[PDB]
Design a protein around this ligand. Sequence first.
Ligand SMILES: [Mg+2]
Ligand SMILES: [Mg+2]
Length: 144
Amino acid sequence: CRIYPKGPLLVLPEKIYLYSEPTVKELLPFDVVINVAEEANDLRMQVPAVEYHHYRWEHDSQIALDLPSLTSIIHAATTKREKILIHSQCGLSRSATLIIAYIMKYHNLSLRHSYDLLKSRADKINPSIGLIFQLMEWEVALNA
Ligand SMILES: [Mg+2]
Ligand SMILES: [Mg+2]
């Protein structure tokens, strides 16, 4: 591919977190955990006090499809003021994409401004082009 040397970085005031691949124990404080990396171990059974979601994204997935469901999981957690972790393998591309996507809908911002917001708090984010295009699709629907 430590990147996040102090653990899961709070990126949004609504207790939205961003990380690379976790260990089991690192998952514990979170109410909702969304794992958007195919190769990243499914830790579901290992943590019963956690609403665990795994979406097996690879860098060439049609992620725009998954975005209504995924951003709804997130919005529903924020109204209940729950602690939320969104992680991938390296916490650069797939997980950042999902957050940016959230920001587009529920912060009512453009792709560009949403990216700018996350890069401002997660300096190392580097969304893949394929994923950027999937986000471009997301921007269209939200504008329809
Ligand atoms: Mg692993
Ligand atoms: Mg493939």
